[PDB]
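Continuing from yesterday's entry. The apo prediction looked reasonable, so today I'm repeating it with nicotinic acid adenine dinucleotide included to see how the binding region is handled. Same sequence as before; SMILES copied from the compound registry.
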Amino acid sequence: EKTEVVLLACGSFNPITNMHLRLFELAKDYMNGTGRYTVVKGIISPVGDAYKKKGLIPAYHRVIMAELATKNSKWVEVDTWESLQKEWKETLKVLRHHQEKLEAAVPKVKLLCGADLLESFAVPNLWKSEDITQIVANYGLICVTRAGNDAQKFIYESDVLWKHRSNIHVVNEWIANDISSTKIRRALRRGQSIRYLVPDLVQEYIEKHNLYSSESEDRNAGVILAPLQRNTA
Amino acid sequence: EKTEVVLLACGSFNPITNMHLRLFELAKDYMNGTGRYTVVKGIISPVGDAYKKKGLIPAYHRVIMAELATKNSKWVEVDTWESLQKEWKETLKVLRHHQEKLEAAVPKVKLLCGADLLESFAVPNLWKSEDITQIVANYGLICVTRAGNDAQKFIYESDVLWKHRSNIHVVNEWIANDISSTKIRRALRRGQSIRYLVPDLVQEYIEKHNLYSSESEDRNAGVILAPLQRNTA
Amino acid sequence: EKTEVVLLACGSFNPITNMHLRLFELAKDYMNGTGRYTVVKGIISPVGDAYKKKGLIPAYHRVIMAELATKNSKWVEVDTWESLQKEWKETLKVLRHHQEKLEAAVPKVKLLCGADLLESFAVPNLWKSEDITQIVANYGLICVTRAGNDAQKFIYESDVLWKHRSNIHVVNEWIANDISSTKIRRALRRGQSIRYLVPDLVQEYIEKHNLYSSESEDRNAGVILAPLQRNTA
Amino acid sequence: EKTEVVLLACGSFNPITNMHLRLFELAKDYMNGTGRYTVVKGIISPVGDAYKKKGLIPAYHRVIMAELATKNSKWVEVDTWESLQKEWKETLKVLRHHQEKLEAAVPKVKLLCGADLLESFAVPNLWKSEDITQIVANYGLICVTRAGNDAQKFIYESDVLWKHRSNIHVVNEWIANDISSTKIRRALRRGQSIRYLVPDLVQEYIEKHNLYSSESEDRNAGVILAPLQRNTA
Amino acid sequence: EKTEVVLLACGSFNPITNMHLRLFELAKDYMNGTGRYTVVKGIISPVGDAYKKKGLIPAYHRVIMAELATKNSKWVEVDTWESLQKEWKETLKVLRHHQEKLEAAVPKVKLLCGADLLESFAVPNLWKSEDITQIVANYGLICVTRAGNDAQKFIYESDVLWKHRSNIHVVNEWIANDISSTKIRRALRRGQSIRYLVPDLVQEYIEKHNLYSSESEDRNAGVILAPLQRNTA
Amino acid sequence: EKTEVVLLACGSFNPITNMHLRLFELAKDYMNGTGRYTVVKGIISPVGDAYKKKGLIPAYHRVIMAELATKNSKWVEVDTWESLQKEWKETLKVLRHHQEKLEAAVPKVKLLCGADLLESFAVPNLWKSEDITQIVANYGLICVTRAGNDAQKFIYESDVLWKHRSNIHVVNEWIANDISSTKIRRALRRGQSIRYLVPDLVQEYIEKHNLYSSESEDRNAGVILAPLQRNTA
Ligand SMILES: Nc1ncnc2c1ncn2[C@@H]1O[C@H](COP(=O)(O)OP(=O)(O)OC[C@H]2O[C@@H]([n+]3cccc(C(=O)O)c3)[C@H](O)[C@@H]2O)[C@@H](O)[C@H]1O
Ligand SMILES: Nc1ncnc2c1ncn2[C@@H]1O[C@H](COP(=O)(O)OP(=O)(O)OC[C@H]2O[C@@H]([n+]3cccc(C(=O)O)c3)[C@H](O)[C@@H]2O)[C@@H](O)[C@H]1O
Ligand SMILES: Nc1ncnc2c1ncn2[C@@H]1O[C@H](COP(=O)(O)OP(=O)(O)OC[C@H]2O[C@@H]([n+]3cccc(C(=O)O)c3)[C@H](O)[C@@H]2O)[C@@H](O)[C@H]1O
Ligand SMILES: Nc1ncnc2c1ncn2[C@@H]1O[C@H](COP(=O)(O)OP(=O)(O)OC[C@H]2O[C@@H]([n+]3cccc(C(=O)O)c3)[C@H](O)[C@@H]2O)[C@@H](O)[C@H]1O
Ligand SMILES: Nc1ncnc2c1ncn2[C@@H]1O[C@H](COP(=O)(O)OP(=O)(O)OC[C@H]2O[C@@H]([n+]3cccc(C(=O)O)c3)[C@H](O)[C@@H]2O)[C@@H](O)[C@H]1O
Ligand SMILES: Nc1ncnc2c1ncn2[C@@H]1O[C@H](COP(=O)(O)OP(=O)(O)OC[C@H]2O[C@@H]([n+]3cccc(C(=O)O)c3)[C@H](O)[C@@H]2O)[C@@H](O)[C@H]1O
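Holo prediction written out below.
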């Protein structure tokens, strides 16, 4: 009857916050609420250090925090495949990977993201055109966000996205919360409480290892983001 | 040297959410960050049932939820005095109570709140004008908010507030947080996840007792908020 | 397999403009486009003069303009049944009348409207709270609007609406062109051209009979709208 | 008494939409309602294919759609001279061509356009500074727009425009329109109805010959706009 | 040839500020700028204390302040007629008075105001509908404002104003300054400097006679504004 | 107890306006109004011509106008040290010059400016980072503005500014004035009145020397601002 689905969220999780977790809760309620789907699992897949994003701290720290964060979740877990590859991995391959790992009525892996990432699809030389087509046509996208109209319009404004709109779901986040990783690192650098913005275990981990600082924010300064170096060379 | 202050946050807490706890964190960082204050304790004071606010479930439960939410707080505690009054009590009075209670240099009690409360000072018949005066003049008011300029403007537009502006500290909430009790109860009636929006013990306590629903939202329908009744009769 | 559906649009249509016609095109495309419905007919049902809406000219003229406006329409037609009733007719009863009429698998009658009409569900005493429930539950509502987030937010704020959410389809109008009747009447009072804002036949008809004036605009001036009368008597 | 004006609108009309026709009716009512002018003719002049604008279909088709759109216009007509020109023509040369054509009291030829075109005067290398001056100074510019306080701000910021302000008439479009050619093409590529957004004959012509597609949309892709080509070499 | 005009500004001038003076410079530059008018004089006409506007100090101080403000003006002067009547005087009358006094080619008197006043034409019972008609029909209105589009729209929305639009001139205040009398009194009450907001002499007359206070702001507290009493009795 | 401060405002004052003078009234009111500062002097320090800002007329005239503008001020004066420097001086140096001067308790010198200058800190290569740091840390900055949430946010978005937030006082301008020099020059070139936007003497001096024109606006056309030239060579 209903189609089973696995929500896969690729990201930097630098560091993970209640917001990324909350992203899962919302997508699940929505998907299960349509009556035509059953969300069987949530997978958080931290990006490997080969991504080179500014300030991106070492993967093990990010993976451990994301594990610490899901420890009390009953349906959301961390998968380390992508973080372990040596070369940065294109989200479409990370999707094809878990979709195949499942084939061994098979659950459909769908990409879970906020409007943020959905919109980078338009940044020049960031995403391969064929990648986007396959991602929305063969897996599906589930976009959670406050600016529901922005996202809806962004879709309307792209022929590929519009064509596969049946396979793309914008999920409104009426409870306006935005605990951005950037604001968190900022708060940390400035010695301010992030208590209640991230899970206590993550907060404790960050504290013990004294993660995030001016030094850390500088990692990868002046280094082009992996996806771009690829489409420029 | 520094003025020790106690942050008293009066409200319904129907139910307490991460946002209300976040409020104490912000205010603490801000007050200590000024260098001229030392925040020694936070006090969550739920409103007795005589308030009659629409949807207000029993005080005892709201008190229990606040204690649950603060089990793991080293400086924020709950105070039941207000919840025990047969007669709804005016915030000015609650403040006098705590200030007088503290005397037994003595820390100063300041009312912690959002811009929602500050602005309601202008709702007709809601607050006693002479009360607004002694609150800001004699105690103080720490107002946390996402719209700092509207709060600023609101203060500038009132001779009483402006005059005593040195006792009104507008605190900026750069991390967009809007976890309103109203949206929580709304999610609850619909069976949606409210995990990571409220502390877990609070979510668990609520799930267990089915505290929020259509029927509870109707409590006090047609009844006049206590303060308004008292200033019209 | 696919649900045959009929779009019924109740409204004053005083006068009908390219915009009301556009409503039918946008909705049909959407429904047909979701793959689960097949729009077979469009019905324009001008409200009866008993509505007593400020500026409402005689129904017969409004009916005829709707006829001219759809004279070339392959699928949209004009039904005079509601206008011919002596008493003002609630939309629920008109929906029933037309659904019952079709039953003589039968096609499902759905209410076609704009954000305007949807949000008026919240005007005190305007709609019976049960008529609303039966409309969204037993019939369905297709709401066309430029401000989609507002319409959706309106659904999210209403338990009843949110509850029958799967029967309420918000359709985005990306080609934002609000040719309101109010601006058409004003333009005619000032002798402006309204050509290309309404179908030529309607334009020509209006000029020939000199329909809109300061006079017609004063019709029902001071009379309380029919739905509000009923709900006060 | 009055000055007899002829409104010349140069543009691509790819394809012409109700809003373009609406442009003429708006301007005629405004110029005539000042009491000091008399609009005697409206001329639509489709740009030639040599303009190399992305997505621009053959002038043959744009001319014929412009003609069907105006077949029932008592005062607006189409002039094929600009399009039939092997070379792309500067608007100044087209204005001139038409003025001179008339002198063979002579009606003043004025440029009819939207805030769009007017604001493009600031696009580096798009318009020759002297051609701008000569258009506003020797011909006149009637700019229809929804954003009157932009067209106005733009004139107030250009010493040149401001100096000839008396010859630049900003006409307000109160019926918030937006039927852009881009959005019509997008809809046609998506097989969506455009009925009631353009004249029936144009709709029928476009449908019958499947004029707009992904293919047509790609015409000239990578080709620099004729004006930019000229002012850079 | 050119029409001579006298700009009459009816207002409370409580107190007058650089902005009121500014109003005249702006209007004069505009009227003269059109090339078809010649501004030969400006007239500031303080409202009589019979207006009963809350906080309105005595006419004599307002008149002396306005004369002091215009001491150095070569073309703007104060007329005391209005302020000298025992009965509050309808602006249409104040206009008729000055126009008749000029006939003693003959300069046309036109009312000079901000958007504030133009728009108050809508407030229920504030202006006798026939007065508005005569003012825009038989004299003319020059409205200076930062919100040129609002005034423009407000006119568009009024059949009366729109019909005589050729006699109404909206003049754009590009160098936005908004020294409202209200903010001046507020600043004064608070002991804040008003230097450089009003003319030095005015600023010095207020300092000398301690004109604005809490006390004064209360004048006419609870007294219905004169025009309102008249149109409700 | 209270700290004596001197407000130093570095800028072009090309030409000085009411607004620049306004800046000192506001800031003196704010600082003394905090109860912990005593503002003893205001200093207008016009920039030397070595600055090379486009359109900057000769130092001498700017200095004279500043003196005419402040002739009658009890506490605000003009210091020509910057105007007399052959090489453009970095604001830090000016601040250092005055501070040292005073030391011959000693008043603290603080930079007075608008949000405009503050935000210019992010213009690439405009200000030397070590300078920004030294200015906010060792001297102080009082920023006046109508968009103080933009200044508040700009401070919050920079670690250095945030780190020194205690030394940066954002002062709200509730009376909305944006009488910029650029708009004044635009008005003068167009022959419009600027009476009441600048003090009378200043306006009289500009009119007598015909200081601002198309020609003057061209000074330094094509030359890089001193600061930018320095940090790029
Ligand atoms: N407030 C908010 N509300 C709702 N969702 C929010 C959010 N803030 C972040 N999010 C979402 O959180 C998730 C993770 O956030 P964050 O830690 O910031 O993750 P971020 O660094 O933005 O992750 C970018 C991801 O895209 C992948 N990518 C980028 C570029 C090209 C290609 C390619 O295959 O060509 C792939 C990349 O490998 C990485 O997995 C995202 O889905 C983001 O949109
Ligand atoms: N998004 C947000 N960001 C920051 N702060 C936010 C917030 N949403 C709520 N808050 C704050 O959270 C706190 C608790 O909220 P909530 O639980 O909804 O509490 P609420 O019902 O708004 O609390 C009303 C309180 O005001 C008192 N009151 C009302 C009227 C007259 C008088 C009187 O003495 O005359 C006193 C009343 O006794 C009670 O203690 C408030 O201070 C609120 O402003
Ligand atoms: N720009 C725009 N974009 C998209 N849609 C737009 C629109 N402007 C109007 N519309 C829609 O066009 C349609 C016709 O509009 P208009 O001519 O103005 O018609 P209008 O007067 O708004 O029609 C109101 C209708 O609601 C019915 N009603 C009202 C209140 C209570 C009850 C009851 O049963 O209790 C029933 C009433 O009998 C009538 O049929 C509406 O659905 C309107 O919202
Ligand atoms: N919503 C709206 N409301 C009101 N008016 C609107 C409008 N959308 C477009 N318009 C107006 O409709 C008209 C037709 O638009 P569209 O079909 O898109 O025509 P478009 O491609 O924008 O036309 C450009 C025209 O400018 C000429 N041009 C461009 C650049 C440099 C020079 C030169 O001599 O140096 C000349 C060019 O030859 C062509 O005739 C325009 O005047 C446009 O602004
Ligand atoms: N920021 C700004 N930009 C441009 N103009 C601005 C302005 N602030 C005020 N102004 C203008 O300044 C002028 C004087 O300001 P202010 O002192 O505040 O004038 P205010 O008290 O608003 O003056 C009301 C005037 O209207 C008359 N009135 C009222 C109601 C009904 C009738 C009737 O005949 O039925 C007549 C009344 O007798 C009095 O002369 C006004 O024209 C105002 O709009
Ligand atoms: N509306 C408004 N409200 C409040 N204040 C306003 C204002 N408009 C301007 N102001 C303020 O007025 C003052 C003077 O205005 P204006 O004449 O336009 O001054 P402007 O030319 O913008 O002043 C530049 C100043 O910055 C210094 N600077 C620039 C770049 C790098 C460095 C360095 O050390 O590296 C120093 C420069 O030497 C000069 O003193 C400024 O503080 C400006 O922000």
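Comparison notes:
- The pocket of nicotinic acid adenine dinucleotide (ligand 6) is lined by residues F 9-14, 19-20, 23, 47, 51, 53, 90-92, 113-114, 116-117, 126-128, 131, 144-145, 178, 180-181, 227 (CB under 6 Å).
- Residues 52 and 224 of chain E are 7 Å apart (CA to CA).
Will overlay with the apo model tomorrow.
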